Design a protein around this ligand. Structure first.
Ligand SMILES: NC(=O)c1ccc[n+]([C@@H]2O[C@H](COP(=O)([O-])OP(=O)(O)OC[C@H]3O[C@@H](n4cnc5c(N)ncnc54)[C@H](OP(=O)(O)O)[C@@H]3O)[C@@H](O)[C@H]2O)c1
Ligand SMILES: NC(=O)c1ccc[n+]([C@@H]2O[C@H](COP(=O)([O-])OP(=O)(O)OC[C@H]3O[C@@H](n4cnc5c(N)ncnc54)[C@H](OP(=O)(O)O)[C@@H]3O)[C@@H](O)[C@H]2O)c1
Ligand SMILES: NC(=O)c1ccc[n+]([C@@H]2O[C@H](COP(=O)([O-])OP(=O)(O)OC[C@H]3O[C@@H](n4cnc5c(N)ncnc54)[C@H](OP(=O)(O)O)[C@@H]3O)[C@@H](O)[C@H]2O)c1
Ligand SMILES: NC(=O)c1ccc[n+]([C@@H]2O[C@H](COP(=O)([O-])OP(=O)(O)OC[C@H]3O[C@@H](n4cnc5c(N)ncnc54)[C@H](OP(=O)(O)O)[C@@H]3O)[C@@H](O)[C@H]2O)c1
Ligand SMILES: Oc1cc(Cl)ccc1Oc1ccccc1
Ligand SMILES: Oc1cc(Cl)ccc1Oc1ccccc1
Ligand SMILES: Oc1cc(Cl)ccc1Oc1ccccc1
Ligand SMILES: Oc1cc(Cl)ccc1Oc1ccccc1
Ligand SMILES: N[C@@H](CCC(=O)O)C(=O)O
Ligand SMILES: N[C@@H](CCC(=O)O)C(=O)O
Ligand SMILES: N[C@@H](CCC(=O)O)C(=O)O
Lengths: 254, 254, 255, 255
């Protein structure tokens, strides 16, 4: 139970977002939630989805993780509005569509560095600023994909940025561990979301899971959220620097 | 909440067993529990340990995992007395003490096959027998150590037996996944227990976690039990063939 | 690589398609003196005629069933008297009953599970203990594994567990023997048509998936495994121990 | 090995202690023609002194700052006009600010993080793209990584996230370029005292932990990295791709 606990959830675009899976689960367990968004359209979606939640107050902050000033001021404002928090769910990534299909060897520098910036660096700066609101410790979770551990077709520039993210989680775990702040990753299997439309061959990936993965079925957003609940809570206190696969066992097979 | 769940916990020897840590967490959460032990000396012990839980019944069965018939009849009796189960915590391993120190290259065939048998194969046979009591599915968790993934001073024959176990998990996950039976490992940090007295250099291992692991501290039997509650419940429903390190972040550093 | 003046024990040739025979042709091509161990008389007969293909001046052949402590102990002790000190050992030995290489892993028998471990994993430990006696100045031991030990693969079953055990064995052997300057490593070979592959269910599907999905879009062969063996058994790999080199067209790196 | 008639581009020699200079001594001794690329004028100057221990009859030296596309694009094009087709590339380039390396990882600045990615990871992708034009019939590309990419090690900080990225880059490049018969691999070198190492906090106690704890109980040197690179750049390692080979006395295999 997560009553009297407060979590910042970053990166809901709409009802299919993985972060909205997380939100539904933490809200059901009684947490207070704060939400961050980039696009105006995502604030609108967030105001609509809050009616499904039991949060008595909408706490919505615009944070583009490309901007230091936005991350620093956003968290500073969260802290002024709700006090100390207990953890952060990071559910944010981006790459240019043309870097998620075709040949990897042709990725542009700005494309590679944009992926890195949003998808991996954002976690370091978020952790640095969120730590100011966790004086007594807490928990930070980021969303990764099996394409960060192995070359999968079409995932390209995002795989290299997932590899970077998963290491960023381990370096943060080491750095922040003596502050009693745990940092972990959830490696979600494929899920139909807005961002998934940019992964060439997504539908093929989906069915390969059904066909080959141990559980012979795809996972959904709520399953990711139930693992997020474990990682964000005291159920997982001994656990830091870890990557938990919520992917029907696919990571364990070949 | 594990009310109306039944779990079989294997491998309680005394108050310091990891499995009594698991027992305690699941008991607090409303689980009915069934226990298995090897020798009477653990039985009498066991019976007194249970007056610290709120099981209204002492469901207790002798099972030496070296005998097929005792594992077969043991699970058979468990089903007759308490019907279907929701999963199994496996907390069982053994090696002869001279193989847990000195030079690995001098391990005997007998001692090697004995560690494999008790520490690894026993999950396969237990899985096959447990499954008969999980027609709607369920969850199997084994306990492993970082020694299965890396060579570690002294742990020697038990490291090749853990490597074996960790692969056994994976292969059981693939096999039993279509029956909705999930199989996972918890990789526990070092913990002072009866078995840990057999491991050469054990105190040096304890101390090194405190100096070097991200959280700068040792884990305990209840932190293992907490993660076992995650793995054994529906929070982990999309998680299988997984190895979760409950070890203060130690797996994640070098 | 120059292997003139060097002597290697290659264990586990049954016929011309053996992975160890690939190893043998490369080392032989490289100037090395080779010693061979076999279990079955039929395998010794294959060695006898496969040796006409090689440049070995004489046939050093020893029956070693790795299930027997006596046979491993006396075979290496014999090897040491006949050829003197050795430079390393190529281990290419596995076994599992056929029932245990298809269908349901969860049905595996104890006797079948310990059989696969005994032959395919423990044999490396004892072979190293006895081989070390002949490498007073250091040396190099290489064993043969499969991706099935790092991931659950359909049908590979009791063997993938035996290969996990093997790969841990190499690391623990590496740590123990490193002070003696004896390096210990694994080659993880892609699928190759051999006599033992005949017992692994869906083998043909395995080979086809490699060709369609692995980076190199082709299968590897025994000689390619031999080349990496030559690297691993020679001074080119000084500094490398406890390592598992995958010779598999890149397959291990993709999902 | 045997490498006469092969031409390799070697990127990242600064001085006589560079890991790349060890690669180059091994390749040169094996008969290869070598082409060198450098960033700083002082590195060129060192290259010219060092070529003198080499059996290279021609200094082929090209300035390439891997921060600039046009420099990588033009340098390789120029290399093509000067030596023609090439057999492989040794990439031995990384960089990170002292200001981010020697403060807490969580305080790494955006520009510092992205500097290290750009120079130490992205540089391989663009180099691979331009090198491929000179490998019509296949080739081999090797980059230099460090255990810090796979585990959080104290002090290495922003460079371990850059190495993690580099190591994914190898895999993704091996997958993309394998159909062109171009193999891409990494060497994970142990600590070696170089100009760059002077940037890594606590470097001396890292050297000492290797002597004390690594299976081989010693450190490795640049020449050892060069020997594993000759294996990787040569037909010895055909069938090997997307691989990370650890030249670290086996320190990767232990805990
Ligand atoms: N779907 C999958 O199968 C899958 C699998 C494994 C991992 N993941 C990971 O899960 C995470 C969430 O993705 P999703 O699939 O749930 O898709 P999503 O709904 O499209 O969410 C992606 C989010 O990232 C936010 N974002 C992008 N750039 C940002 C920026 N510069 N600053 C702040 N926010 C930014 C987007 O916000 P705006 O819309 O406001 O721009 C959006 O809310 C990603 O890390 C993804 O890589 C997804
Ligand atoms: N403690 C640690 O630091 C550590 C760390 C990582 C992983 N683990 C793992 O945790 C698990 C539990 O060990 P522990 O530390 O909790 O020690 P423990 O309290 O001594 O428990 C070991 C149990 O194994 C049982 N056992 C041994 N052989 C058996 C057999 N043939 N049949 C049935 N039961 C058998 C023992 O029963 P009897 O006493 O009745 O013989 C005992 O209850 C083991 O798998 C261990 O390897 C331990
Ligand atoms: N083929 C593949 O796709 C593949 C892939 C990866 C790894 N591997 C591994 O490569 C190694 C060689 O196998 P292979 O495919 O080359 O098949 P093979 O030609 O069938 O070789 C197997 C060898 O093991 C020997 N052997 C079995 N039990 C023995 C025992 N108790 N004592 C002494 N020798 C014993 C056999 O000798 P006898 O016939 O005389 O009994 C035979 O020479 C094995 O470890 C296998 O797991 C093979
Ligand atoms: N030494 C170790 O303990 C160790 C261990 C494992 C891995 N490594 C890796 O080995 C590789 C070689 O490093 P090292 O130890 O040999 O150090 P080094 O002698 O200082 O070599 C590093 C090279 O990187 C080059 N470089 C940096 N920025 C560049 C740029 N923008 N464009 C072109 N070249 C650039 C430098 O050239 P300029 O001098 O012209 O700027 C220098 O030649 C690096 O990737 C390092 O991370 C080193
Ligand atoms: O990381 C993702 C993996 C899958 Cl399988 C589908 C969607 C994913 O999310 C993104 C994919 C590319 C760019 C940004 C987010
Ligand atoms: O697996 C164990 C690891 C550690 Cl660190 C301590 C105790 C452990 O449990 C056993 C260790 C050796 C033999 C049997 C059980
Ligand atoms: O280990 C092997 C892997 C593959 Cl894909 C094919 C054959 C192999 O060799 C053996 C497989 C099973 C039993 C003994 C040897
Ligand atoms: O990557 C390195 C690892 C070690 Cl241990 C020492 C030196 C290394 O090389 C660099 C370290 C930091 C920035 C540039 C290169
Ligand atoms: N968007 C994918 C379509 C293929 C699929 O999803 O299967 C592509 O353009 O490659
Ligand atoms: N070996 C297979 C036959 C077909 C195949 O190899 O794919 C089996 O017995 O199942
Ligand atoms: N390089 C260290 C000094 C001593 C060491 O290498 O251990 C530092 O400047 O932080």
């Amino acid at each position: 139970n997560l009553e009297n606990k407060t979590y910042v959830i970053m990166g809901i675009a709409n009802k299919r977002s993985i972060a909205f899976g997380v939100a539904k689960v933490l809200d059901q367990l009684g947490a207070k939630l704060v939400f961050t968004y980039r696009k105006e359209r995502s604030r609108k979606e967030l105001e609509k989805l809050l009616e499904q939640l039991n949060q008595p107050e909408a706490h919505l902050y615009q944070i583009d993780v490309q901007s230091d000033e936005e991350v620093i001021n956003g968290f500073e404002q969260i802290g002024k509005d709700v006090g100390n928090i207990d953890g952060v769910y990071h559910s944010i990534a981006f790459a240019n569509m043309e870097d998620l299909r075709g040949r990897f060897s042709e990725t542009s520098r700005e494309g590679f560095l944009l992926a890195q910036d949003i998808s991996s660096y954002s976690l370091t700066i978020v952790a640095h600023e969120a730590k100011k609101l966790m004086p007594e410790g807490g928990s930070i979770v980021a969303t990764t994909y099996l394409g960060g551990e192995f070359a999968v077709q079409n995932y390209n520039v995002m795989g290299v940025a997932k590899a970077s993210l998963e290491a960023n989680v381990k370096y943060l775990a080491l750095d922040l561990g003596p502050d009693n702040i745990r940092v972990n990753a959830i490696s979600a299997g494929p899920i139909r979301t807005l961002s998934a439309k940019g992964v060439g061959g997504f539908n093929t990936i989906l069915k390969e899971i059904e066909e080959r993965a141990p559980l012979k079925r795809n996972v959904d957003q709520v399953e990711v959220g139930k693992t997020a609940a474990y990682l964000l809570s005291d159920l997982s206190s001994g656990v830091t620097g870890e990557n938990i696969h919520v992917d029907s066992g696919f990571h364990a097979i070949k």
